[PDB]
């Protein structure tokens, strides 16, 4: 895969590697799931999420 197309499938950040290799990454306050693409919050108030709306759909 490649980060310029479709964000490399990553939810957040994407690094291209030597070979047909790609690594997804997540911002501080998130961890990468075993699918290698998804990011899940690890803190109560992660950046870029709106608590009253997250609660509204939780």
């Amino acid at each position: 895969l490649i980060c310029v197309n479709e964000n490399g499938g990553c939810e957040q950040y994407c690094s291209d590697h030597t070979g047909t290799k790609r690594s997804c990454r997540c911002h501080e306050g998130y961890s990468l799931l075993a699918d290698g693409v998804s990011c899940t919050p690890t803190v109560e108030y992660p950046c870029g999420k709106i608590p009253i709306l997250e609660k509204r759909n939780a």
């Binding site: 911002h27 990011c39 950046c47 870029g48």
Partner: protein, 250 residues
């Protein structure tokens, strides 16, 4: 903000209000507990750098509801390339004197990686711009925080569609040419925030235009992707005596 709506209390939780001697100066964007991004031009006329206050969790300026958090601004960092009274490199990094406490009403916007911002976020059409600026060109400022969804243009298309500073590579256009919808005076420094797969990111800073909601013209925003590495380096630096710091760019 012209032609937008009230941002429901808590739905713009990264919005910062900057005050000088208690008076509305500019907007800004919280990006973690001690750092705020604003516009360099907000500070062109500051006389006493020690009267600058940042307020988080603000919504209705007419009242105090207890969600507000005020901090002194310990540092204003401006790139070496910014020239006062002009438009290019219109960005400032502010260090708060004490961290804000993250709450339902106070949350940072994610500062994206450059590559992610250039390759993906730059192609998300609509983004939100917010502030307590003028509700109309030559009009009164808002008491409630306002927000507006604006579409981004490629710069060639902006120049094509517009009808006087250049749009440099450190800028981008967003909004509408029919004079209905724009950011306006007092909104300067505020966020242009972009949603991608469930999360919001800082892509722009309210910077300038040919007046507010002027027919034939678009809002101009500082292109934050150009500054990610500059900001990230500064956020790792120790504080220096004296509020204003000019830092080399790149």
């Amino acid at each position: 903000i012209v032609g937008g709506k009230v941002c429901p209390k808590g739905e713009c939780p990264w919005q910062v209000l900057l005050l000088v001697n208690g008076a509305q100066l500019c907007g800004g964007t919280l990006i973690n507990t001690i750092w705020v991004v604003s516009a360099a031009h907000c500070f062109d006329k500051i006389k006493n750098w020690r009267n600058l206050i940042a307020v988080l969790g603000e919504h209705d300026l007419s009242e105090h509801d207890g969600d507000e958090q005020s901090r002194r601004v310990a540092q204003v960092i401006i790139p070496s390339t910014y020239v006062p009274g002009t438009t290019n490199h219109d960005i400032a990094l502010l260090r708060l004197h004490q961290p804000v406490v993250l709450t339902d009403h106070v949350v940072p916007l994610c500062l994206p990686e450059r590559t992610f911002s250039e390759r993906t976020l730059a192609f998300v059409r609509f983004s939100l711009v917010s502030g307590w600026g003028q509700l109309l060109d030559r009009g009164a400022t808002a008491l409630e925080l306002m927000v507006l969804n604006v579409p981004r243009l490629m710069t060639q298309d902006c120049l094509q569609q517009s009808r006087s500073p250049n749009i440099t590579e450190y800028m981008f256009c967003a909004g509408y040419s029919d004079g209905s919808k724009d950011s306006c005076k007092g909104d300067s420094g505020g966020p242009h925030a972009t949603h991608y797969r469930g999360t919001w990111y800082l892509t722009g800073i309210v910077s300038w235009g040919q007046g507010c909601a002027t027919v034939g013209h678009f809002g101009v925003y500082t292109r934050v992707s150009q500054y990610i590495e500059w900001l990230q380096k500064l956020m790792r630096s120790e504080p220096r005596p004296g509020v204003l710091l000019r830092a080399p760019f790149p």
